Short mmCIF file of C-alpha atoms in Angstrom, two decimals:
data_model
loop_
_atom_site.label_atom_id
_atom_site.label_comp_id
_atom_site.label_asym_id
_atom_site.label_seq_id
_atom_site.Cartn_x
_atom_site.Cartn_y
_atom_site.Cartn_z
CA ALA A 16 -44.68 4.01 54.79
CA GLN A 17 -41.15 4.66 55.13
CA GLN A 18 -38.79 4.66 52.05
CA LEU A 19 -36.99 1.37 50.96
CA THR A 20 -33.89 0.87 49.14
CA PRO A 21 -33.03 -1.44 46.00
CA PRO A 22 -30.80 -4.40 46.82
CA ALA A 23 -28.11 -2.18 44.92
CA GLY A 24 -27.81 1.31 43.18
CA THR A 25 -29.89 4.54 43.88
CA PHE A 26 -33.68 4.75 43.06
CA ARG A 27 -34.78 8.27 42.77
CA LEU A 28 -38.29 9.91 42.28
CA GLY A 29 -39.27 12.95 40.78
CA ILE A 30 -42.43 14.72 39.53
CA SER A 31 -43.25 17.25 36.85
CA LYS A 32 -46.27 19.55 36.11
CA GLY A 33 -45.85 21.10 32.66
CA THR A 34 -42.45 22.40 32.13
CA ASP A 35 -41.59 22.27 35.81
CA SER A 36 -40.06 19.42 37.60
CA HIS A 37 -37.92 18.53 40.66
CA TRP A 38 -36.47 15.35 42.29
CA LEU A 39 -38.49 14.47 45.32
CA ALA A 40 -36.62 14.72 48.64
CA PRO A 41 -36.59 11.65 51.16
CA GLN A 42 -39.98 12.24 53.01
CA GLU A 43 -41.27 14.96 50.53
CA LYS A 44 -45.14 15.21 50.63
CA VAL A 45 -47.01 15.59 47.33
CA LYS A 46 -50.52 16.87 46.88
CA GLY A 47 -52.77 13.88 45.68
CA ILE A 48 -49.86 11.29 45.42
CA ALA A 49 -49.11 8.85 48.26
CA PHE A 50 -45.85 6.49 48.64
CA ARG A 51 -46.27 3.26 50.36
CA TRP A 52 -43.27 0.93 50.54
CA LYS A 53 -43.39 -2.80 51.32
CA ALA A 54 -40.51 -5.31 51.77
CA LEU A 55 -40.43 -8.55 49.54
CA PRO A 56 -40.84 -11.64 51.87
CA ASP A 57 -39.23 -14.38 49.67
CA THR A 58 -36.33 -12.53 47.69
CA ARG A 59 -34.43 -9.52 48.53
CA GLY A 60 -36.33 -6.15 47.41
CA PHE A 61 -39.35 -4.20 47.59
CA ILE A 62 -42.69 -3.05 46.10
CA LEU A 63 -43.53 0.66 45.85
CA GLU A 64 -47.15 1.79 45.25
CA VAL A 65 -47.68 5.13 43.93
CA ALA A 66 -51.52 6.13 44.81
CA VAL A 67 -52.61 8.84 42.47
CA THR A 68 -55.68 10.63 43.69
CA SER A 69 -55.21 14.22 42.18
CA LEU A 70 -52.97 15.59 39.31
CA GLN A 71 -52.83 19.18 41.14
CA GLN A 72 -49.20 19.24 42.08
CA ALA A 73 -47.84 16.78 39.52
CA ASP A 74 -49.00 15.64 35.94
CA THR A 75 -46.07 13.22 35.50
CA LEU A 76 -43.81 10.78 37.56
CA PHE A 77 -40.34 10.38 36.95
CA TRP A 78 -37.70 7.82 38.22
CA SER A 79 -34.05 7.31 37.75
CA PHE A 80 -31.81 4.35 38.49
CA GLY A 81 -28.07 4.55 38.53
CA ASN A 82 -25.22 2.24 40.17
CA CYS A 83 -23.27 5.04 41.44
CA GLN A 84 -19.63 3.40 41.59
CA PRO A 85 -17.10 4.90 39.27
CA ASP A 86 -14.63 2.47 40.53
CA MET A 87 -16.60 -0.79 39.05
CA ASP A 88 -15.44 -2.55 36.20
CA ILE A 89 -19.04 -3.40 34.81
CA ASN A 90 -22.21 -1.70 34.90
CA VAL A 91 -24.58 -2.46 32.23
CA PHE A 92 -28.33 -2.21 31.50
CA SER A 93 -30.97 -4.50 29.68
CA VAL A 94 -34.23 -3.10 29.17
CA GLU A 95 -37.29 -5.30 28.28
CA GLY A 96 -40.55 -3.29 27.94
CA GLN A 97 -41.29 -1.82 31.24
CA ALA A 98 -38.76 -3.93 33.05
CA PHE A 99 -34.98 -3.97 33.22
CA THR A 100 -31.76 -5.67 34.63
CA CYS A 101 -28.65 -4.34 35.90
CA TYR A 102 -25.35 -6.21 35.82
CA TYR A 103 -22.88 -4.44 38.15
CA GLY A 104 -19.68 -5.40 39.80
CA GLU A 105 -16.52 -7.24 37.98
CA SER A 106 -16.29 -10.60 36.01
CA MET A 107 -15.12 -12.44 39.10
CA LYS A 108 -18.11 -11.10 41.05
CA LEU A 109 -20.88 -10.20 38.78
CA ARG A 110 -24.28 -9.33 40.47
CA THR A 111 -27.71 -8.95 39.04
CA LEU A 112 -30.50 -6.76 40.00
CA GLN A 113 -34.01 -6.90 38.42
CA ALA A 114 -36.77 -4.30 38.26
CA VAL A 115 -40.25 -3.71 36.96
CA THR A 116 -41.72 -0.07 36.59
CA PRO A 117 -45.38 1.34 35.43
CA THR A 118 -44.18 2.17 31.79
CA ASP A 119 -41.84 1.17 28.97
CA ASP A 120 -40.89 4.98 28.37
CA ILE A 121 -37.40 3.99 29.71
CA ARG A 122 -34.17 6.01 28.40
CA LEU A 123 -30.33 5.36 28.54
CA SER A 124 -29.62 8.79 30.05
CA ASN A 125 -26.64 10.84 31.09
CA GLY A 126 -26.58 11.00 35.08
CA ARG A 127 -24.62 14.18 34.98
CA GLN A 128 -27.52 15.95 33.11
CA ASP A 129 -29.96 15.43 36.11
CA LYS A 130 -30.48 18.84 37.63
CA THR A 131 -34.19 18.15 37.27
CA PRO A 132 -36.10 14.94 35.96
CA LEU A 133 -37.19 16.63 32.68
CA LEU A 134 -33.39 17.54 31.90
CA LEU A 135 -32.50 13.99 32.80
CA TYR A 136 -34.85 12.46 30.64
CA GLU A 137 -34.21 14.67 27.52
CA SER A 138 -30.37 14.12 28.20
CA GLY A 139 -28.23 13.04 25.17
CA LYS A 140 -24.79 13.84 25.88
CA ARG A 141 -22.38 11.01 25.29
CA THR A 142 -21.73 8.58 28.22
CA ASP A 143 -19.79 5.31 28.68
CA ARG A 144 -21.71 4.70 32.03
CA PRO A 145 -25.32 5.62 31.43
CA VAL A 146 -28.07 5.68 34.16
CA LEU A 147 -31.83 4.73 33.37
CA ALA A 148 -34.55 7.44 33.41
CA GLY A 149 -38.20 6.74 33.01
CA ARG A 150 -41.61 8.84 32.24
CA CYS A 151 -44.83 7.77 34.03
CA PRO A 152 -47.69 10.02 32.67
CA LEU A 153 -50.27 10.11 35.62
CA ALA A 154 -54.05 9.70 35.78
CA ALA A 155 -56.36 10.53 38.96
CA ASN A 156 -57.85 7.53 40.88
CA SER A 157 -55.02 5.21 39.70
CA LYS A 158 -52.20 3.26 41.16
CA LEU A 159 -48.65 2.65 39.89
CA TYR A 160 -46.25 0.01 40.81
CA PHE A 161 -42.40 -0.52 41.12
CA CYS A 162 -40.58 -3.53 41.89
CA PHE A 163 -36.69 -3.98 42.62
CA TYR A 164 -35.57 -7.47 43.27
CA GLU A 165 -32.63 -9.88 43.10
CA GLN A 166 -32.80 -13.44 41.16
CA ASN A 167 -31.14 -16.65 42.34
CA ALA A 168 -29.47 -17.62 38.92
CA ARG A 169 -30.23 -21.26 38.83
CA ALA A 170 -27.85 -22.84 36.18
CA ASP A 171 -29.38 -25.60 34.07
CA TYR A 172 -26.25 -27.45 33.67
CA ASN A 173 -23.39 -28.47 36.25
CA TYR A 174 -20.26 -30.30 35.37
CA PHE A 175 -21.06 -33.46 37.10
CA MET A 176 -24.40 -33.96 35.31
CA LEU A 177 -22.57 -33.59 31.69
CA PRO A 178 -20.78 -37.23 31.34
CA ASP A 179 -24.42 -38.84 31.88
CA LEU A 180 -26.32 -36.44 29.84
CA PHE A 181 -23.74 -36.71 26.84
CA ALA A 182 -24.19 -40.51 27.26
CA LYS A 183 -28.08 -40.39 27.09
CA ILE A 184 -28.20 -38.19 24.18
CA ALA B 4 -18.44 -36.47 15.50
CA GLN B 5 -18.43 -33.32 13.55
CA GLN B 6 -17.59 -29.68 15.19
CA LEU B 7 -20.52 -27.92 16.86
CA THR B 8 -20.60 -24.11 17.35
CA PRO B 9 -21.82 -22.07 20.41
CA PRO B 10 -25.27 -20.18 20.16
CA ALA B 11 -22.88 -17.06 19.66
CA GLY B 12 -19.14 -16.44 19.36
CA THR B 13 -16.21 -18.43 18.55
CA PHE B 14 -14.94 -21.44 20.69
CA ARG B 15 -11.42 -22.35 19.90
CA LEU B 16 -9.33 -25.41 21.10
CA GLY B 17 -5.70 -25.76 21.40
CA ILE B 18 -3.13 -28.26 22.80
CA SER B 19 0.33 -28.01 24.51
CA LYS B 20 3.39 -30.20 24.90
CA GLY B 21 5.90 -28.76 27.08
CA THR B 22 6.67 -25.11 26.19
CA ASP B 23 5.21 -25.86 22.66
CA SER B 24 1.60 -25.21 21.73
CA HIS B 25 -0.62 -24.65 18.62
CA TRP B 26 -4.54 -23.89 18.14
CA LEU B 27 -6.31 -26.92 16.54
CA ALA B 28 -7.50 -26.87 12.99
CA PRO B 29 -11.29 -27.64 12.36
CA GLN B 30 -10.85 -31.35 11.69
CA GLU B 31 -7.18 -31.52 13.12
CA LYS B 32 -6.54 -35.11 14.48
CA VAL B 33 -4.38 -35.50 17.79
CA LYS B 34 -2.58 -38.57 18.99
CA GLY B 35 -4.72 -39.97 22.14
CA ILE B 36 -7.26 -37.42 22.03
CA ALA B 37 -10.73 -37.61 20.53
CA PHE B 38 -13.48 -35.14 20.27
CA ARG B 39 -17.21 -36.05 20.05
CA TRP B 40 -19.68 -33.34 19.71
CA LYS B 41 -23.53 -33.68 20.49
CA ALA B 42 -26.24 -31.30 20.27
CA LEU B 43 -28.38 -30.31 23.07
CA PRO B 44 -32.25 -31.50 22.52
CA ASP B 45 -33.96 -29.32 24.94
CA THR B 46 -32.22 -25.93 24.70
CA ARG B 47 -29.92 -24.18 22.02
CA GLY B 48 -26.27 -25.57 22.48
CA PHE B 49 -23.83 -28.44 22.58
CA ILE B 50 -21.77 -30.90 24.85
CA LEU B 51 -18.27 -31.73 23.98
CA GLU B 52 -16.58 -34.93 25.12
CA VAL B 53 -12.77 -34.70 24.85
CA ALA B 54 -11.62 -38.37 25.40
CA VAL B 55 -8.01 -38.52 26.67
CA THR B 56 -6.49 -41.96 26.00
CA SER B 57 -2.80 -40.88 25.80
CA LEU B 58 -0.43 -37.74 26.54
CA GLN B 59 1.96 -38.55 23.72
CA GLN B 60 0.97 -35.73 21.57
CA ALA B 61 -0.47 -33.17 24.41
CA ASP B 62 -0.11 -32.91 28.23
CA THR B 63 -2.63 -29.85 28.23
CA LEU B 64 -5.72 -28.84 26.61
CA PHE B 65 -6.52 -25.14 25.96
CA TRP B 66 -9.49 -23.29 24.90
CA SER B 67 -10.62 -19.67 24.26
CA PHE B 68 -14.02 -17.85 23.89
CA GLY B 69 -14.73 -14.57 22.48
CA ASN B 70 -17.59 -12.61 21.07
CA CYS B 71 -15.79 -11.26 17.94
CA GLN B 72 -17.86 -7.98 17.14
CA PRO B 73 -16.16 -4.58 17.94
CA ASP B 74 -19.17 -2.88 16.42
CA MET B 75 -21.27 -4.28 19.52
CA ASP B 76 -21.79 -1.97 22.51
CA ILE B 77 -21.99 -4.83 25.15
CA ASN B 78 -19.71 -7.76 25.76
CA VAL B 79 -18.94 -8.78 29.35
CA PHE B 80 -17.94 -12.21 31.12
CA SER B 81 -19.11 -13.28 34.64
CA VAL B 82 -16.68 -16.42 35.76
CA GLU B 83 -17.95 -18.70 38.61
CA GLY B 84 -15.47 -21.55 39.05
CA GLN B 85 -15.33 -23.76 35.84
CA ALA B 86 -18.56 -21.99 34.51
CA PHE B 87 -19.00 -18.70 32.94
CA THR B 88 -21.72 -16.29 31.46
CA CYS B 89 -21.41 -14.02 28.41
CA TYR B 90 -23.70 -11.00 28.24
CA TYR B 91 -23.42 -9.54 24.60
CA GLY B 92 -25.40 -6.97 22.40
CA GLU B 93 -27.03 -3.74 23.58
CA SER B 94 -29.20 -2.44 26.13
CA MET B 95 -32.34 -2.73 24.05
CA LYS B 96 -31.30 -6.35 23.00
CA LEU B 97 -28.95 -8.12 25.43
CA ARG B 98 -28.49 -11.90 25.04
CA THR B 99 -27.12 -14.33 27.41
CA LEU B 100 -24.80 -17.36 26.71
CA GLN B 101 -23.87 -19.81 29.30
CA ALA B 102 -20.89 -22.33 29.51
CA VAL B 103 -19.27 -25.25 31.64
CA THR B 104 -15.59 -26.10 31.29
CA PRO B 105 -13.41 -28.83 32.82
CA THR B 106 -11.26 -26.54 35.04
CA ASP B 107 -11.68 -23.28 37.18
CA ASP B 108 -8.24 -22.24 35.45
CA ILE B 109 -9.89 -19.09 33.44
CA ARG B 110 -8.38 -15.93 32.60
CA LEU B 111 -9.80 -12.72 30.98
CA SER B 112 -6.95 -12.87 28.36
CA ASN B 113 -6.04 -10.38 25.42
CA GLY B 114 -7.48 -11.69 22.15
CA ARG B 115 -4.71 -9.96 20.21
CA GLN B 116 -2.06 -12.16 22.04
CA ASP B 117 -3.35 -15.40 20.72
CA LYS B 118 -0.59 -16.46 18.35
CA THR B 119 -0.48 -19.82 20.37
CA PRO B 120 -2.46 -20.96 23.52
CA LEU B 121 0.34 -20.50 25.92
CA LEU B 122 0.82 -16.88 24.73
CA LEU B 123 -2.84 -15.94 24.97
CA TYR B 124 -3.21 -17.72 28.45
CA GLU B 125 -0.26 -15.51 29.90
CA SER B 126 -1.41 -12.49 28.06
CA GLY B 127 -1.34 -9.39 30.31
CA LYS B 128 -1.71 -6.55 27.96
CA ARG B 129 -4.70 -4.31 28.91
CA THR B 130 -7.95 -4.66 26.82
CA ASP B 131 -11.25 -3.11 27.01
CA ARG B 132 -12.95 -6.17 25.42
CA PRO B 133 -11.12 -9.42 26.55
CA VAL B 134 -11.43 -13.00 25.81
CA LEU B 135 -11.77 -15.87 28.15
CA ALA B 136 -9.01 -18.58 28.01
CA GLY B 137 -8.84 -21.70 30.17
CA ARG B 138 -6.06 -24.27 30.82
CA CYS B 139 -7.15 -28.05 31.23
CA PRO B 140 -4.02 -30.26 32.42
CA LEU B 141 -4.57 -33.68 30.88
CA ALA B 142 -4.50 -37.26 32.34
CA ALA B 143 -4.56 -40.58 30.38
CA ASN B 144 -7.75 -42.75 30.19
CA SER B 145 -9.94 -39.66 31.50
CA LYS B 146 -12.90 -37.68 29.67
CA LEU B 147 -13.27 -33.89 29.77
CA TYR B 148 -16.49 -31.93 29.04
CA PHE B 149 -17.74 -28.72 27.75
CA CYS B 150 -21.20 -27.36 27.36
CA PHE B 151 -22.36 -24.14 25.86
CA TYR B 152 -26.05 -23.40 26.15
CA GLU B 153 -28.71 -20.54 26.34
CA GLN B 154 -31.11 -20.03 29.35
CA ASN B 155 -34.68 -19.06 28.88
CA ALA B 156 -35.04 -15.95 31.06
CA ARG B 157 -38.00 -16.48 33.37
CA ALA B 158 -38.60 -13.14 35.41
CA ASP B 159 -39.92 -13.98 38.96
CA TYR B 160 -42.17 -10.56 38.82
CA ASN B 161 -44.30 -9.09 36.39
CA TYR B 162 -46.33 -5.57 36.46
CA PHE B 163 -49.57 -7.80 36.33
CA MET B 164 -48.93 -9.55 39.62
CA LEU B 165 -47.62 -6.45 41.50
CA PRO B 166 -51.07 -5.07 42.68
CA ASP B 167 -52.06 -8.57 44.34
CA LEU B 168 -48.71 -9.01 45.77
CA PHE B 169 -48.66 -5.61 47.35
CA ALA B 170 -52.08 -6.36 49.02
CA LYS B 171 -50.84 -9.86 50.23
CA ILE B 172 -47.86 -8.49 52.06
#
């Protein structure tokens, strides 16, 4: 019901209708589109359900993900289809955020060219710290889903298992 | 017996005796120290066993690791104790290399300052693409281990499960 936030960074929602677009305000109402947010019980994170009934106000849904700390040493994204990974922090404290989106239409975009979703998506100006922008073409009587979560990086090998493993091979 | 290579990058071994140090040559023999390499049967990678018998030629073992492609967009390190992770490639094709070393004495050093292991380790010159360098103080009748391996990125959530999981919460 109430907007939930990712384990890190800023997840922003926008809508377009033809050549018109704008970023949605925190509790902004959209004609034909409803937003339900549910917290993840196991790991840190959430699922968002975009319930599309009508395309009267919006033809497309837009989203943008950015780790808005210009002081951080590391901030990189890995995109695999409709999913992405964000590595943020420093070498001595590297954190991982994982996310799953409705479409594979994800672009490394310039966060300073974000006046509207359509300007961010078609942004191409040179940037050392890009943000991610996504395009979700909408359909009536359909549901779209998002998932932002953290993964416990279970290392397959520890130093104390290595001497036995070396002798075993 | 024969030197093995990591799934990516270059793993270099060096030794020191007092204020004197040098990087070991591919089949360079060291008095009191033997190097046995074994391939990992499950995943892509290897284990190295540094068998120390005597400290007559060397009191300290040194090592370096770097991804030597300046053309490459991304190369970042995450160090957690005596273990590290390397994220290399581009956003659209990011790869992960994992490693286990004998000590937690790991530094983001400057590759250009690598004439000797002691110069690399104490390098303070600022660089955008550092190399990892570690110090392993040696002891007679002891064994040190290294492990370079790749981890199969099993994503905890997929878009197919999201509608059921949302309804389940």
